[PDB]
Tab-separated table of C-alpha atoms and ligand atoms in Angstrom:
chain	number	residue	atom	x	y	z
A	1	UNK	CA	0.018	-0.050	0.036
A	2	UNK	CA	1.116	3.555	-0.745
A	3	UNK	CA	1.217	5.865	2.345
A	4	UNK	CA	-2.090	7.890	2.363
A	5	UNK	CA	-2.199	11.592	2.484
A	6	UNK	CA	-3.973	13.425	5.276
A	7	UNK	CA	-4.735	17.012	5.425
A	8	UNK	CA	-4.835	18.658	8.955
A	9	UNK	CA	-7.489	21.289	9.410
A	10	UNK	CA	-5.903	23.228	12.208
A	11	UNK	CA	-8.423	26.169	11.790
A	12	UNK	CA	-10.359	27.927	14.487
A	13	UNK	CA	-13.720	28.037	12.639
A	14	UNK	CA	-15.496	25.960	10.055
A	15	UNK	CA	-15.519	28.598	7.381
A	16	UNK	CA	-11.765	28.842	7.623
A	17	UNK	CA	-11.479	25.044	7.204
A	18	UNK	CA	-13.751	25.183	4.262
A	19	UNK	CA	-11.519	27.649	2.476
A	20	UNK	CA	-9.031	24.603	2.416
A	21	UNK	CA	-11.491	21.732	1.882
A	22	UNK	CA	-13.221	23.400	-1.075
A	23	UNK	CA	-9.752	23.331	-2.852
A	24	UNK	CA	-8.292	19.947	-1.744
A	25	UNK	CA	-10.851	17.546	-0.255
A	26	UNK	CA	-10.690	15.404	-3.364
A	27	UNK	CA	-6.906	15.599	-3.402
A	28	UNK	CA	-6.363	13.743	-0.174
A	29	UNK	CA	-7.360	10.500	1.469
A	30	UNK	CA	-8.050	11.608	5.002
A	31	UNK	CA	-9.564	14.860	6.425
A	32	UNK	CA	-8.431	15.601	9.947
A	33	UNK	CA	-10.381	17.830	12.237
A	34	UNK	CA	-7.439	19.411	13.799
A	35	UNK	CA	-7.226	19.837	17.631
A	36	UNK	CA	-7.442	23.597	16.994
A	37	UNK	CA	-10.790	23.035	15.237
A	38	UNK	CA	-12.013	20.532	17.943
A	39	UNK	CA	-11.484	23.337	20.472
A	40	UNK	CA	-12.615	26.159	18.269
A	41	UNK	CA	-15.882	24.612	17.119
A	42	UNK	CA	-16.374	21.466	19.090
A	43	UNK	CA	-17.562	18.119	17.810
A	44	UNK	CA	-19.979	19.638	15.325
A	45	UNK	CA	-16.780	20.078	13.167
A	46	UNK	CA	-16.503	16.212	12.908
A	47	UNK	CA	-20.279	15.922	12.152
A	48	UNK	CA	-20.159	18.636	9.510
A	49	UNK	CA	-17.077	17.515	7.789
A	50	UNK	CA	-18.145	13.815	7.546
A	51	UNK	CA	-21.517	15.008	6.170
A	52	UNK	CA	-19.673	16.974	3.482
A	53	UNK	CA	-17.099	14.229	2.694
A	54	UNK	CA	-18.720	10.929	3.743
A	55	UNK	CA	-16.395	8.886	1.225
A	56	UNK	CA	-13.161	10.217	3.067
A	57	UNK	CA	-11.822	8.940	6.400
A	58	UNK	CA	-12.453	11.582	8.967
A	59	UNK	CA	-9.920	11.736	11.869
A	60	UNK	CA	-10.893	13.628	14.994
A	61	UNK	CA	-7.535	14.861	16.436
A	62	UNK	CA	-9.046	15.341	19.845
A	63	UNK	CA	-5.748	14.269	21.725
A	64	UNK	CA	-7.831	12.494	24.430
A	65	UNK	CA	-6.102	12.642	27.768
A	66	UNK	CA	-8.726	11.216	30.013
A	67	UNK	CA	-12.502	10.203	29.891
A	68	UNK	CA	-11.506	7.939	26.994
A	69	UNK	CA	-15.028	6.257	26.749
A	70	UNK	CA	-16.890	9.679	26.980
A	71	UNK	CA	-14.781	11.665	24.545
A	72	UNK	CA	-14.426	8.875	22.072
A	73	UNK	CA	-18.224	8.206	22.040
A	74	UNK	CA	-18.815	11.960	21.441
A	75	UNK	CA	-16.582	11.917	18.385
A	76	UNK	CA	-17.875	8.566	17.081
A	77	UNK	CA	-21.598	9.772	17.396
A	78	UNK	CA	-20.460	12.686	15.335
A	79	UNK	CA	-19.372	10.077	12.699
A	80	UNK	CA	-15.623	10.150	13.094
A	81	UNK	CA	-13.843	7.240	11.592
A	82	UNK	CA	-10.620	7.571	13.789
A	83	UNK	CA	-9.798	9.391	16.927
A	84	UNK	CA	-6.565	10.351	18.679
A	85	UNK	CA	-5.557	9.699	22.214
A	86	UNK	CA	-2.399	11.587	23.641
A	87	UNK	CA	0.443	9.361	24.610
A	88	UNK	CA	0.400	10.326	28.324
A	89	UNK	CA	-3.129	9.271	28.780
A	90	UNK	CA	-3.621	6.604	31.376
A	91	UNK	CA	-3.594	3.068	29.715
A	92	UNK	CA	-7.254	2.653	30.698
A	93	UNK	CA	-8.185	5.821	28.819
A	94	UNK	CA	-6.646	4.319	25.581
A	95	UNK	CA	-8.413	1.068	26.267
A	96	UNK	CA	-11.658	2.803	26.853
A	97	UNK	CA	-11.438	4.805	23.710
A	98	UNK	CA	-10.617	1.707	21.775
A	99	UNK	CA	-13.476	-0.248	23.146
A	100	UNK	CA	-15.937	2.409	22.002
A	101	UNK	CA	-14.117	2.662	18.467
A	102	UNK	CA	-14.963	-0.973	17.991
A	103	UNK	CA	-18.733	-0.389	18.541
A	104	UNK	CA	-18.670	2.045	15.673
A	105	UNK	CA	-16.251	0.080	13.470
A	106	UNK	CA	-13.728	3.065	13.905
A	107	UNK	CA	-10.165	3.101	15.243
A	108	UNK	CA	-7.979	4.822	17.762
A	109	UNK	CA	-4.474	6.348	17.204
A	110	UNK	CA	-1.978	7.125	19.966
A	111	UNK	CA	-0.515	10.598	19.393
A	112	UNK	CA	3.148	10.498	20.153
A	113	UNK	CA	4.031	14.107	20.955
A	114	UNK	CA	6.298	15.281	23.728
A	115	UNK	CA	7.160	12.721	26.439
A	116	UNK	CA	6.480	8.983	26.128
A	117	UNK	CA	8.336	5.607	26.739
A	118	UNK	CA	9.104	2.383	24.895
A	119	UNK	CA	7.313	0.564	27.777
A	120	UNK	CA	4.177	2.556	26.997
A	121	UNK	CA	4.602	1.559	23.349
A	122	UNK	CA	4.452	-2.146	24.537
A	123	UNK	CA	1.451	-1.511	26.643
A	124	UNK	CA	-0.574	0.100	23.655
A	125	UNK	CA	0.333	-2.884	21.606
A	126	UNK	CA	-0.814	-5.308	24.354
A	127	UNK	CA	-4.011	-3.353	24.586
A	128	UNK	CA	-4.691	-4.019	20.822
A	129	UNK	CA	-3.879	-0.523	19.593
A	130	UNK	CA	-2.803	-0.761	15.932
A	131	UNK	CA	-1.927	2.943	15.097
A	132	UNK	CA	0.467	5.519	16.312
A	133	UNK	CA	1.145	9.093	15.078
A	134	UNK	CA	4.745	9.924	15.253
A	135	UNK	CA	4.175	13.755	15.555
A	136	UNK	CA	6.879	16.366	16.075
A	137	UNK	CA	5.498	19.066	18.252
A	138	UNK	CA	4.757	22.411	16.523
A	139	UNK	CA	6.375	24.133	19.454
A	140	UNK	CA	9.452	21.866	19.472
A	141	UNK	CA	9.682	22.637	15.703
A	142	UNK	CA	9.326	26.294	16.351
A	143	UNK	CA	12.186	26.026	18.878
A	144	UNK	CA	14.433	24.600	16.112
A	145	UNK	CA	14.045	20.799	16.581
A	146	UNK	CA	14.514	19.194	13.171
A	147	UNK	CA	13.679	15.788	11.897
A	148	UNK	CA	16.770	13.459	12.556
A	149	UNK	CA	18.098	9.933	12.414
A	150	UNK	CA	16.826	9.185	15.869
A	151	UNK	CA	13.272	9.874	14.481
A	152	UNK	CA	13.880	7.504	11.638
A	153	UNK	CA	15.069	4.664	13.997
A	154	UNK	CA	12.114	5.340	16.441
A	155	UNK	CA	9.652	5.113	13.468
A	156	UNK	CA	11.117	1.897	12.224
A	157	UNK	CA	11.034	0.568	15.713
A	158	UNK	CA	7.296	1.393	16.117
A	159	UNK	CA	6.616	-0.199	12.650
A	160	UNK	CA	8.544	-3.385	13.755
A	161	UNK	CA	6.349	-3.603	16.790
A	162	UNK	CA	3.281	-3.950	14.549
A	163	UNK	CA	1.936	-0.414	14.511
A	164	UNK	CA	0.697	1.327	11.413
A	165	UNK	CA	2.725	4.537	11.671
A	166	UNK	CA	1.576	7.991	10.684
A	167	UNK	CA	4.322	10.663	10.242
A	168	UNK	CA	3.608	14.406	10.947
A	169	UNK	CA	4.719	17.713	12.299
A	170	UNK	CA	5.649	20.512	9.976
A	171	UNK	CA	6.274	18.059	7.069
A	172	UNK	CA	7.400	19.764	3.963
A	173	UNK	CA	7.551	18.093	0.542
A	174	UNK	CA	11.377	17.775	0.677
A	175	UNK	CA	11.117	15.856	4.017
A	176	UNK	CA	9.513	12.799	2.398
A	177	UNK	CA	12.700	10.946	1.257
A	178	UNK	CA	13.871	10.743	4.907
A	179	UNK	CA	11.328	7.974	5.463
A	180	UNK	CA	11.892	6.009	2.225
A	181	UNK	CA	11.773	2.294	2.738
A	182	UNK	CA	9.526	2.358	5.773
A	183	UNK	CA	5.931	1.264	5.201
A	184	UNK	CA	4.397	4.524	6.446
A	185	UNK	CA	0.697	4.299	6.752
A	186	UNK	CA	-0.115	8.113	6.474
A	187	UNK	CA	1.707	11.344	5.953
A	188	UNK	CA	-0.105	14.431	7.347
A	189	UNK	CA	0.309	17.900	6.038
A	190	UNK	CA	-1.335	20.911	7.604
A	191	UNK	CA	0.498	24.183	6.994
A	192	UNK	CA	2.357	22.847	3.845
A	193	UNK	CA	-0.918	22.257	2.134
A	194	UNK	CA	-3.273	25.014	3.659
A	195	UNK	CA	-0.875	27.805	3.499
A	196	UNK	CA	0.747	27.032	0.061
A	197	UNK	CA	0.365	29.583	-2.680
A	198	UNK	CA	-1.327	26.701	-4.440
A	199	UNK	CA	-2.983	24.190	-2.189
A	200	UNK	CA	-3.969	21.950	-5.017
A	201	UNK	CA	-0.417	21.803	-6.356
A	202	UNK	CA	0.934	21.284	-2.905
A	203	UNK	CA	-1.279	18.245	-2.359
A	204	UNK	CA	-0.668	16.798	-5.694
A	205	UNK	CA	3.129	17.169	-5.341
A	206	UNK	CA	2.881	15.263	-1.977
A	207	UNK	CA	0.957	12.409	-3.713
A	208	UNK	CA	3.361	12.515	-6.697
A	209	UNK	CA	6.384	12.166	-4.450
A	210	UNK	CA	4.863	9.410	-2.304
A	211	UNK	CA	3.912	7.496	-5.502
A	212	UNK	CA	7.515	7.752	-6.767
A	213	UNK	CA	9.127	6.935	-3.482
A	214	UNK	CA	6.877	3.943	-2.502
B	1	UNK	CA	-5.445	28.931	54.079
B	2	UNK	CA	-8.473	26.901	53.082
B	3	UNK	CA	-8.417	24.795	50.011
B	4	UNK	CA	-10.767	26.337	47.421
B	5	UNK	CA	-13.620	24.384	45.662
B	6	UNK	CA	-13.777	24.063	41.856
B	7	UNK	CA	-16.781	22.631	39.992
B	8	UNK	CA	-15.978	20.656	36.890
B	9	UNK	CA	-18.486	21.161	34.192
B	10	UNK	CA	-17.862	17.940	32.184
B	11	UNK	CA	-21.153	18.349	30.363
B	12	UNK	CA	-21.600	17.757	26.566
B	13	UNK	CA	-23.690	20.930	25.999
B	14	UNK	CA	-24.053	24.329	27.489
B	15	UNK	CA	-27.617	23.891	28.637
B	16	UNK	CA	-26.525	20.803	30.603
B	17	UNK	CA	-23.739	22.809	32.290
B	18	UNK	CA	-26.183	25.644	33.145
B	19	UNK	CA	-28.494	23.126	34.914
B	20	UNK	CA	-25.531	22.901	37.328
B	21	UNK	CA	-24.289	26.452	37.331
B	22	UNK	CA	-27.639	28.097	38.080
B	23	UNK	CA	-27.558	26.007	41.292
B	24	UNK	CA	-23.948	26.278	42.493
B	25	UNK	CA	-22.089	29.107	40.738
B	26	UNK	CA	-22.227	31.012	43.961
B	27	UNK	CA	-21.447	27.889	46.062
B	28	UNK	CA	-17.997	27.364	44.548
B	29	UNK	CA	-14.848	29.317	43.914
B	30	UNK	CA	-13.773	28.242	40.501
B	31	UNK	CA	-15.858	27.395	37.454
B	32	UNK	CA	-14.168	24.905	35.271
B	33	UNK	CA	-15.089	24.451	31.709
B	34	UNK	CA	-14.554	20.691	31.443
B	35	UNK	CA	-12.585	19.104	28.654
B	36	UNK	CA	-15.807	17.277	27.721
B	37	UNK	CA	-17.562	20.788	27.464
B	38	UNK	CA	-14.778	22.251	25.420
B	39	UNK	CA	-14.900	19.367	22.971
B	40	UNK	CA	-18.725	19.349	23.033
B	41	UNK	CA	-19.342	23.120	22.351
B	42	UNK	CA	-15.874	24.545	21.584
B	43	UNK	CA	-14.328	27.648	23.058
B	44	UNK	CA	-17.661	29.486	23.123
B	45	UNK	CA	-18.289	27.599	26.401
B	46	UNK	CA	-15.492	29.615	27.958
B	47	UNK	CA	-16.787	32.944	26.606
B	48	UNK	CA	-20.482	32.252	27.595
B	49	UNK	CA	-19.603	30.982	31.102
B	50	UNK	CA	-17.287	34.021	31.849
B	51	UNK	CA	-20.043	36.347	30.647
B	52	UNK	CA	-22.588	34.801	33.004
B	53	UNK	CA	-20.092	34.833	35.906
B	54	UNK	CA	-17.424	37.509	35.328
B	55	UNK	CA	-16.539	37.764	38.981
B	56	UNK	CA	-15.496	34.088	39.195
B	57	UNK	CA	-12.304	32.414	38.163
B	58	UNK	CA	-13.057	30.410	34.922
B	59	UNK	CA	-10.752	27.639	34.042
B	60	UNK	CA	-10.555	26.191	30.541
B	61	UNK	CA	-9.615	22.455	31.028
B	62	UNK	CA	-8.137	22.221	27.496
B	63	UNK	CA	-5.494	19.753	28.447
B	64	UNK	CA	-3.224	21.350	25.722
B	65	UNK	CA	-0.879	18.777	24.230
B	66	UNK	CA	0.747	20.891	21.451
B	67	UNK	CA	0.335	24.178	19.827
B	68	UNK	CA	0.624	25.958	23.237
B	69	UNK	CA	0.526	29.529	21.973
B	70	UNK	CA	-2.469	29.002	19.615
B	71	UNK	CA	-4.729	27.074	21.852
B	72	UNK	CA	-3.981	29.133	24.912
B	73	UNK	CA	-4.657	32.306	22.903
B	74	UNK	CA	-8.062	30.914	21.814
B	75	UNK	CA	-8.993	30.223	25.446
B	76	UNK	CA	-7.730	33.523	26.740
B	77	UNK	CA	-9.379	35.507	23.881
B	78	UNK	CA	-12.659	33.784	25.163
B	79	UNK	CA	-11.884	35.309	28.546
B	80	UNK	CA	-10.422	32.347	30.359
B	81	UNK	CA	-8.458	33.054	33.679
B	82	UNK	CA	-6.577	29.753	33.816
B	83	UNK	CA	-5.799	27.049	31.306
B	84	UNK	CA	-4.511	23.427	31.571
B	85	UNK	CA	-1.546	22.003	29.706
B	86	UNK	CA	-1.203	18.120	29.726
B	87	UNK	CA	2.101	17.206	31.402
B	88	UNK	CA	3.608	15.149	28.551
B	89	UNK	CA	3.492	18.329	26.313
B	90	UNK	CA	6.776	19.367	24.917
B	91	UNK	CA	8.277	21.935	27.302
B	92	UNK	CA	8.035	24.603	24.680
B	93	UNK	CA	4.234	23.986	24.445
B	94	UNK	CA	3.978	24.720	28.231
B	95	UNK	CA	6.176	27.784	27.759
B	96	UNK	CA	4.171	29.073	24.864
B	97	UNK	CA	0.891	28.725	26.779
B	98	UNK	CA	2.421	30.493	29.824
B	99	UNK	CA	3.784	33.349	27.577
B	100	UNK	CA	0.182	34.019	26.245
B	101	UNK	CA	-1.338	33.624	29.803
B	102	UNK	CA	0.937	36.342	31.127
B	103	UNK	CA	-0.325	38.569	28.339
B	104	UNK	CA	-3.966	38.192	29.611
B	105	UNK	CA	-2.934	38.266	33.229
B	106	UNK	CA	-3.938	34.577	33.518
B	107	UNK	CA	-2.186	31.435	34.394
B	108	UNK	CA	-1.341	27.840	33.306
B	109	UNK	CA	-1.695	24.573	35.298
B	110	UNK	CA	0.144	21.457	34.329
B	111	UNK	CA	-2.383	18.516	34.435
B	112	UNK	CA	-0.494	15.386	35.715
B	113	UNK	CA	-1.025	11.916	33.966
B	114	UNK	CA	1.091	8.999	32.724
B	115	UNK	CA	4.876	8.467	33.475
B	116	UNK	CA	5.980	12.109	34.414
B	117	UNK	CA	9.232	12.513	36.149
B	118	UNK	CA	10.606	14.730	38.903
B	119	UNK	CA	13.162	16.350	36.489
B	120	UNK	CA	10.232	17.314	34.258
B	121	UNK	CA	8.625	18.863	37.391
B	122	UNK	CA	11.777	20.927	37.940
B	123	UNK	CA	11.461	21.928	34.253
B	124	UNK	CA	7.992	23.266	34.846
B	125	UNK	CA	9.130	25.280	37.821
B	126	UNK	CA	12.089	26.580	35.987
B	127	UNK	CA	9.841	27.664	33.194
B	128	UNK	CA	7.788	29.621	35.739
B	129	UNK	CA	4.859	27.267	36.063
B	130	UNK	CA	3.339	27.712	39.661
B	131	UNK	CA	0.279	25.284	39.544
B	132	UNK	CA	-0.176	21.556	39.012
B	133	UNK	CA	-3.298	19.312	39.029
B	134	UNK	CA	-2.646	16.138	40.730
B	135	UNK	CA	-5.353	14.061	38.980
B	136	UNK	CA	-6.615	10.509	39.238
B	137	UNK	CA	-7.735	9.577	35.760
B	138	UNK	CA	-11.538	8.811	35.474
B	139	UNK	CA	-10.601	5.713	33.551
B	140	UNK	CA	-8.029	4.563	36.151
B	141	UNK	CA	-10.634	5.097	38.792
B	142	UNK	CA	-13.076	2.939	36.853
B	143	UNK	CA	-10.509	0.228	36.682
B	144	UNK	CA	-10.209	0.363	40.480
B	145	UNK	CA	-7.281	2.832	41.191
B	146	UNK	CA	-7.768	4.157	44.672
B	147	UNK	CA	-6.206	7.132	46.421
B	148	UNK	CA	-3.449	6.137	48.832
B	149	UNK	CA	-0.002	6.587	50.241
B	150	UNK	CA	2.049	7.289	47.184
B	151	UNK	CA	-0.289	10.095	46.134
B	152	UNK	CA	0.194	11.887	49.558
B	153	UNK	CA	3.901	11.673	49.243
B	154	UNK	CA	3.984	12.970	45.673
B	155	UNK	CA	1.496	15.790	46.427
B	156	UNK	CA	3.590	16.921	49.382
B	157	UNK	CA	6.796	16.908	47.234
B	158	UNK	CA	5.065	18.948	44.521
B	159	UNK	CA	3.886	21.502	47.265
B	160	UNK	CA	7.593	21.618	48.650
B	161	UNK	CA	8.856	22.282	45.065
B	162	UNK	CA	6.804	25.483	45.151
B	163	UNK	CA	3.633	24.394	43.176
B	164	UNK	CA	0.145	25.185	44.219
B	165	UNK	CA	-1.390	21.731	43.948
B	166	UNK	CA	-5.009	20.996	42.937
B	167	UNK	CA	-6.308	17.590	43.734
B	168	UNK	CA	-9.004	15.933	41.662
B	169	UNK	CA	-10.481	12.667	40.167
B	170	UNK	CA	-13.765	11.272	41.297
B	171	UNK	CA	-13.424	12.952	44.729
B	172	UNK	CA	-16.093	12.093	47.211
B	173	UNK	CA	-16.547	13.890	50.445
B	174	UNK	CA	-15.062	10.906	52.386
B	175	UNK	CA	-11.710	11.386	50.470
B	176	UNK	CA	-10.948	14.782	51.866
B	177	UNK	CA	-9.493	13.582	55.222
B	178	UNK	CA	-6.692	11.774	53.276
B	179	UNK	CA	-5.226	15.136	52.425
B	180	UNK	CA	-5.497	16.769	55.777
B	181	UNK	CA	-2.426	18.650	56.826
B	182	UNK	CA	-1.233	19.361	53.256
B	183	UNK	CA	-1.682	23.001	51.902
B	184	UNK	CA	-3.961	21.964	48.986
B	185	UNK	CA	-4.821	24.950	46.890
B	186	UNK	CA	-7.980	23.610	45.210
B	187	UNK	CA	-10.207	20.540	45.341
B	188	UNK	CA	-12.233	19.856	42.147
B	189	UNK	CA	-15.564	17.982	42.128
B	190	UNK	CA	-17.365	17.171	39.037
B	191	UNK	CA	-19.727	14.207	39.365
B	192	UNK	CA	-19.810	14.463	43.232
B	193	UNK	CA	-21.619	17.825	42.805
B	194	UNK	CA	-23.220	17.746	39.396
B	195	UNK	CA	-24.906	14.245	39.926
B	196	UNK	CA	-25.942	14.580	43.613
B	197	UNK	CA	-29.611	14.696	44.489
B	198	UNK	CA	-28.976	18.209	45.674
B	199	UNK	CA	-25.957	19.817	43.946
B	200	UNK	CA	-26.261	22.930	46.263
B	201	UNK	CA	-26.074	20.745	49.463
B	202	UNK	CA	-23.251	18.645	48.011
B	203	UNK	CA	-21.303	21.767	47.381
B	204	UNK	CA	-21.950	23.062	50.877
B	205	UNK	CA	-20.936	19.671	52.401
B	206	UNK	CA	-17.550	19.862	50.669
B	207	UNK	CA	-17.197	23.543	51.900
B	208	UNK	CA	-18.086	22.556	55.472
B	209	UNK	CA	-15.686	19.604	55.552
B	210	UNK	CA	-12.838	21.643	54.137
B	211	UNK	CA	-13.462	24.378	56.748
B	212	UNK	CA	-13.267	21.764	59.462
B	213	UNK	CA	-10.351	19.724	58.208
B	214	UNK	CA	-8.197	22.953	57.345
B	215	UNK	CA	-9.588	25.240	59.973
C	1	LIG	O1	1.712	19.887	9.074
C	1	LIG	P1	1.289	20.655	10.390
C	1	LIG	O2	0.984	22.176	10.151
C	1	LIG	O3	2.309	20.569	11.457
C	1	LIG	O4	-0.042	19.973	10.898
C	1	LIG	C1	-0.119	18.590	11.128
C	1	LIG	C2	0.085	18.237	12.608
C	1	LIG	O5	0.010	16.854	12.833
C	1	LIG	C3	-0.882	19.044	13.504
C	1	LIG	O6	-2.200	18.806	13.066
C	1	LIG	C4	-0.756	18.640	14.808
C	1	LIG	O7	-1.646	17.774	15.435
C	1	LIG	N1	0.211	19.002	15.545
C	1	LIG	O8	0.269	18.651	16.940
C	2	LIG	O1	-14.872	14.900	40.042
C	2	LIG	P1	-14.865	14.356	38.603
C	2	LIG	O2	-16.149	13.930	38.004
C	2	LIG	O3	-13.754	13.255	38.472
C	2	LIG	O4	-14.258	15.462	37.589
C	2	LIG	C1	-13.174	16.430	37.942
C	2	LIG	C2	-12.061	15.959	36.947
C	2	LIG	O5	-10.861	16.758	37.280
C	2	LIG	C3	-12.394	15.991	35.467
C	2	LIG	O6	-12.905	17.332	35.309
C	2	LIG	C4	-11.144	15.838	34.736
C	2	LIG	O7	-10.531	16.802	34.206
C	2	LIG	N1	-10.752	14.600	34.615
C	2	LIG	O8	-9.576	14.205	33.891
C	3	LIG	MG1	-3.354	17.397	14.237
C	4	LIG	MG1	-11.492	18.616	34.100
């Protein structure tokens, strides 16, 4: 399988998000309700986006930290396909969210941003979690933290544990060759698509490069 | 000084939250916009609740995990006084949220969960963070995790490091004596107030017990 392409709608309001979706919804595989849009608009953003694009996978990037069953159910009742749980959530939070995902035939991803451990990685695996998002923090990036070999070896290690790995966090087109040879499940782009002079070209170039590399 | 009482509005809609606030707004110190309510309604929950109760401290329990400046600014533009940042956030995320908080004369709390370390705690202090929320996860609680010895020791050590400590996570009235003798800044009660037969009397019982235990 080729890595899928996900657009992150890190917008504060629906109308701002639609400025992007009206250009590129058909140019990507997955539409993400970004955490910024989850907090700006609430779960209506999931419901509205899935009604607009029912044939796309909709990911609610809620970064659930507790109340796994409650928050997941809210997102799944709004018709999310997938939801995120932040890495430092209690293991029972992740388990809870996953139990609810299964009722809706959806899925849970653990968002790996900031501090987490390899022991937690094993715990998620034993809990039946099959997806992680290897996600360089926007704020770490802004402080000058680049992608590096340690990221590549961590991603390969996660893949080898049986996770379908998503790669994200200020990704630019030119970053993609860093990950060649790894069976990446999804690459996410937010800013590099939404804020490009031509969002359509930016999305197609991502897809082109992925097809060439994989 | 008496521990203050915070009500957690973990409601999915505003009207459900108001069924509680109309009863207990004046019976508590801090009004928390629960994570559940932030995700249910979005940041308008902060704006609306502050407009109803402008004289109270309003906490947006956003549990910010990244994009500290952006999310914190959304909450503070909605007139929040305090915001939460989840403890595994990159340190620059915590710093970013605090930078924006100071611009609004507000504050940030680090919300404790997972496998945080004492060196990370020192980082938060060094970054200028003065509040932490020592929380038992709802889901841990449902799996049978109880308050106990290790919690008391950790809370005391956080206080000695200079943090004001909030304690929370399925607190019932009978849990308060466990923390006697520790200078707790805030106790949060969500379910134990919202779901009581009489929310007003539940809140007052918490206040009476605190006044006795810390008096
Ligand atoms: O490509 P970006 O602008 O960094 O956005 C994608 C990223 O995954 C964000 O949505 C995010 O969740 N950051 O924490
Ligand atoms: O007393 P509760 O129903 O547990 O609610 C308070 C708690 O702090 C929640 O608001 C929360 O943030 N749980 O993670
Ligand atoms: Mg995101
Ligand atoms: Mg809360």
